[PDB]
Amino acid sequence: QYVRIKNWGSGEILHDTLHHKATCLGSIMNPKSLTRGPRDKPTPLEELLPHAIEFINQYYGSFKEAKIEEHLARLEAVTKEIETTGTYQLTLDELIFATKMAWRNAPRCIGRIQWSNLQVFDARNCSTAQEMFQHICRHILYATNNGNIRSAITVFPQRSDGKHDFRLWNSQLIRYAGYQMPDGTIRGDAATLEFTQLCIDLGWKPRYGRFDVLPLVLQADGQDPEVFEIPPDLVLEVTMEHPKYEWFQELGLKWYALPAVANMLLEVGGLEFPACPFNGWYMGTEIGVRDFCDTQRYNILEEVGRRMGLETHTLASLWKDRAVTEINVAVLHSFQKQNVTIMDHHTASESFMKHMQNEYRARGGCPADWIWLVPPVSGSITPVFHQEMLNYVLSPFYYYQIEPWKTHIWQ
């Protein structure tokens, strides 16, 4: 059967079949259903082996020209591998496939039309935190590409017993430090207060700035994490300026060009990769609305309002809506001016709609979390708002993890 899905803007109807391949608390950010926690022992054969077979089938079934001999031979090899060793190793080709599929299956990602365009750095041979650091640097460097942003993923060694996990303690590859000031005030990124403390506690020298790039906190083979400063030549920044307001530059705002997730787990055919940093390119509203205007972040709304000469004390004036748009054009303008890849939320919405349509035609569905896909600003002025969606967990998938410091056994 199917689930009937309606696009209220265009009246269009779609039939979801794909939800049958799946594995209200919808407005929860980090639900347990979206988390893949730690392990003390390897995954039971009873659950590993069927998952593995399904992946191999999915992998071979994706081929335009089917190769039955290779498929059955690989099915045989993998089965024998799991039954005798208690685990298995993917081929590079299978890993590349897994990373794209997991992105294709990320319900919270608006940039999925790009799913097939991903550079994969195989770091499964990695053994030390220094080698992890080198892989992360190469990733930052490749992905940054002097502002011509490229989507990439670095896949570190898979979880074995769960006592030898490779982990990136950071939220993101590039992110700013947040300090609780003696004044009671907060400096920089209020969202990294706890993690900034962790870095300081592990020997990081805090420069006490508003835009201090946090260090890499790398855990290799279950060992205690090691702190590494990101070479500043690798961190590309965009200084904020408005195309009409000269005073915008005076706010002294900047942002990093690279949106890279550092802390997620890639699940593929029973295998778990607890260290697999990935990136795309920015969507303007993420910096302009979330990073600059949330009270839990840089919180600049009032200042941009006052400087525009608006009624900052009457909500009914819509000064907040007026200010947010200027911040958003500034973000867009600044990235454009400085030759750095950025996408506006309107263009992204249309792109996702095209992708979703392609996905229903290609496989009878697209897992999509409406709450995440709808831009944080101008919702209904956007096609995705009027689109009914089905949110489900397929495989391969990118899961959240429990924060490493909460489960790590020290030395």
Ligand X SMILES: C[C@H](O)[C@H](O)[C@H]1CNc2nc(N)[nH]c(=O)c2N1
Amino acid at 55: F
The pair of structure tokens assigned to 4 is: 């009937």
Which CB atom, from 44 or from 379, has the smaller least distance to a copy of itself?
379
Residue 330: how many CA atoms within 13 Å on its side-chain side? 27
- Residue 316, binding choice from a copy of itself, ligand HEM, ligand X, none, Cβ under 5 to 8 Å by partner class: a copy of itself
What is the radius of gyration, based on Cα positions, of the chain? 22
Among 55, 176, 255, 281, binds ligand HEM (CB under 6 A): 281
Q: Based on the residue annotation, tell me whether 187 is a catalytic residue of this protein.
A: no
List C-alpha distances in Å: 341 to 140, 236, 258, 316, 336.
15, 12, 9, 36, 7
- Residue 360, binding choice from a copy of itself, ligand A54, ligand X, none, Cβ under 5 to 8 Å by partner class: none
DSSP 130-194: HHHHHHHHHHHHHHHGGG----EEEEPPPPSSSSS--EE-SSBSS-B-EEE-TTS-EEE-GGGHH
Among 282, 298, 335, 398, binds ligand A54 (CB under 6 A): 282
Residues 234-273, interacting with ligand A54 (CB under 6 A): 259-261
Q: Based on the residue annotation, tell me whether 109 is a catalytic residue of this protein.
A: yes
Q: Is position 323 an interface residue for ligand HEM (rule: CB under 6 A)?
A: no
User: Which residue of the chain is nearest ligand HEM when measured via CB?
Assistant: 280
What are residue 131's phi and psi, to 5 degrees? -70, -35
x/- track of binding to ligand HEM for residues 327-346 (CB under 6 A): ----------------x---
Interacting residues of 261 by C-beta distance below 8 A, sequence separation 6+? 171, 172, 173, 277, 278, 279, 398
In angstroms, the CA 138 to CA 154 distance is 9
Among 376, 400, 402, 405, binds a copy of itself (CB under 8 A): 376
Q: Is position 168 an interface residue for ligand A54 (rule: CB under 6 A)?
A: no
- Residue 170, binding choice from ligand HEM, ligand X, ligand A54, none, Cβ under 5 to 8 Å by partner class: none
Q: Which stretch binds a copy of itself (CB under 8 A): 18-26, 53-61, 73-81, 137-145?
A: 18-26
Which CB atom, from 85 or from 347, has the smaller least distance to ligand X?
347
- Residue 331, binding choice from ligand A54, a copy of itself, ligand HEM, none, Cβ under 5 to 8 Å by partner class: none
Q: Based on the residue annotation, tell me whether 46 is a catalytic residue of this protein.
A: no
In angstroms, the CA 269 to CA 47 distance is 10
Q: Whose CA is closest to 254, among 242, 271, 240?
A: 240
- Which single residue is written with the structure tokens 């060009």? 257
SS3 10: coil
The pair of structure tokens assigned to 51 is: 């998952």
Which CB atom, from 27 or from 185, has the smaller least distance to ligand X?
27
Q: Based on the residue annotation, tell me whether 247 is a catalytic residue of this protein.
A: no
Which residues are marked as active site? 109, 112, 281, 286
List contacts with ligand HEM (CB under 6 A): 103, 106, 108-111, 114, 118, 151, 153, 261, 278-281, 283, 286, 343, 348, 372, 398
